[PDB]
Paper text:
The anti-SIRPα blocking antibody clone AB21 was discovered from immunized SynVH chickens, which contain human VH immunoglobulin (Ig) repertoires paired with the natural chicken light chain repertoires. Since clone AB21 contained the chicken light chain sequences, we carried out humanization as described in the Materials and Methods to derive the humanized version, named hAB21. Humanized AB21 (hAB21) retains the SIRPα binding and antagonistic properties of the parental AB21. The structure of a Fab version of the antibody in complex with the IgV domain of human SIRPα v1 was solved by X-ray crystallography. The hAB21 Fab binds to SIRPα at an epitope highly overlapping with that of CD47, with the VL domain overlapping with the majority of the CD47 binding site while the VH domain CDR-H3 inserts into the central pocket of SIRPα that is crucial for CD47 binding, in agreement with the ability of hAB21 to completely block and antagonize the CD47–SIRPα interaction. The chimeric antibody AB21 binds to human SIRPα v1 and v2 alleles with picomolar affinity, potently blocks the interaction between CD47 and SIRPα, and cross-reacts with cynomolgus and murine SIRPα. Two allelic variants of SIRPα, v1 and v2, are present in the human population at various frequencies and zygosities dependent on ethnicity.
Residue numbers in the entry:
A (entry chain L): 3 to 214
B (entry chain S): 3 to 117
């Protein structure tokens, strides 16, 4: 198996290294592949250190011992992506991949989230379910804590989603949906998500009251 | 340790015919391409390259895209007296700036009978 770190980070303009281990220089050829989300990978490097003509000069590769390394020389915000190492193991006629390494660019200082709250639509309420949504927009870094409150702390009734680092401003945005019965929605009054983030001195609560 | 075998010391062929230059390897590790040359000097002439390049006179005897393949024999079509000489099958290993020559067959002397 090939192993690479889940993540690596770099300031724009600087040089980043990403290495896979678990190969063997004499019985492997290596390649590197760039992927944004669930889209087609793009080949950066093949045969250890060869670069297709369409690939920028800032990407290079090398290999030795049990190891293969992709180097990016002048990290740009658009290089935010997941980087896979792919080997051909000549001993076993196989093609192992690493788990991929996400390149996080630091570019950004801490940026507090703008927090917004959305109550369920009347439309949705006829259908017999209430969805409540908390939006955390354009913050950095990734780590955030969202807690839902009907004044009591609800758990296991919520699910979150995060964008990838934006290619231009290097921010993330996060959504949390609280899902309740309308029965449940109608018997309670105060809806609130509490957002804890490094860019916020103290937690930001945002709330509506059901009838208003 | 990997050996490159050229089983035929010499090959005689009529002009305009196909010449078969045979070569097998005992292992695919260490990794690296196989090439054919005419000559073993610094002026040696590249005949076939597994990595890259276009060689329209040259066909391979086996399917080199077979992961398993260890046969690197080639056929050179419509031979002429200008084709005669000693042909060498060469294994390179991977090397940093360039790949470096690792093992060679003992050569194959290709003779061409004119007309």
């Amino acid at each position: 198996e090939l192993t690479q770190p889940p993540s690596v980070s770099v300031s724009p303009g600087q040089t980043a290294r990403i290495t896979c281990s678990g190969g063997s220089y004499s019985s492997y050829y290596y390649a590197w592949y760039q992927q944004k989300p669930g889209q087609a990978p793009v080949t950066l490097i093949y045969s250890d250190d060869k670069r297709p003509s369409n690939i920028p000069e800032r990407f290079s590769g090398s290999s030795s011992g049990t190891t293969v390394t992709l180097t990016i020389t002048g990290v740009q915000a658009e290089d935010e992506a997941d980087y896979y190492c792919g080997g051909y193991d000549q001993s076993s006629y196989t093609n192992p991949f690493g788990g991929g390494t996400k390149l996080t660019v630091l570019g950004q200082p801490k940026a507090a989230p703008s927090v917004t709250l959305f109550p369920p639509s009347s439309e949705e309420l006829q259908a017999n379910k209430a969805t409540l949504v908390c939006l955390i927009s354009d913050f950095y870094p990734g780590a955030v804590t969202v807690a839902w409150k009907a004044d009591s702390s609800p758990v296991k009734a919520g699910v979150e989603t995060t964008t990838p680092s934006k290619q231009s401003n290097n921010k993330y945005a996060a959504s949390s949906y609280l899902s309740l019965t309308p029965e449940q929605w109608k018997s309670h009054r105060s809806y609130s998500c509490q957002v804890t983030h490094e860019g916020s001195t103290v937690e930001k609560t945002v709330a509506p009251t059901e009838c208003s | 340790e990997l050996q490159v075998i050229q089983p035929d010391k010499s090959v005689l062929v009529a002009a305009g015919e196909t010449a078969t230059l045979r070569c097998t390897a005992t292992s695919l590790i260490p990794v690296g391409p196989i090439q054919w040359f005419r000559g073993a000097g610094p002026g040696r002439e590249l005949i076939y390259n597994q990595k890259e390049g276009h060689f329209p006179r040259v066909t391979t005897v086996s399917d080199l895209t077979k992961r398993n393949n260890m046969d690197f024999s080639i056929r050179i079509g419509a031979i002429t007296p200008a084709d005669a000489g000693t042909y060498y099958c060469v294994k390179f290993r991977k090397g940093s700036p360039d790949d470096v020559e690792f093992k060679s067959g003992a050569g194959t002397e290709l003779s061409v009978r004119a007309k």
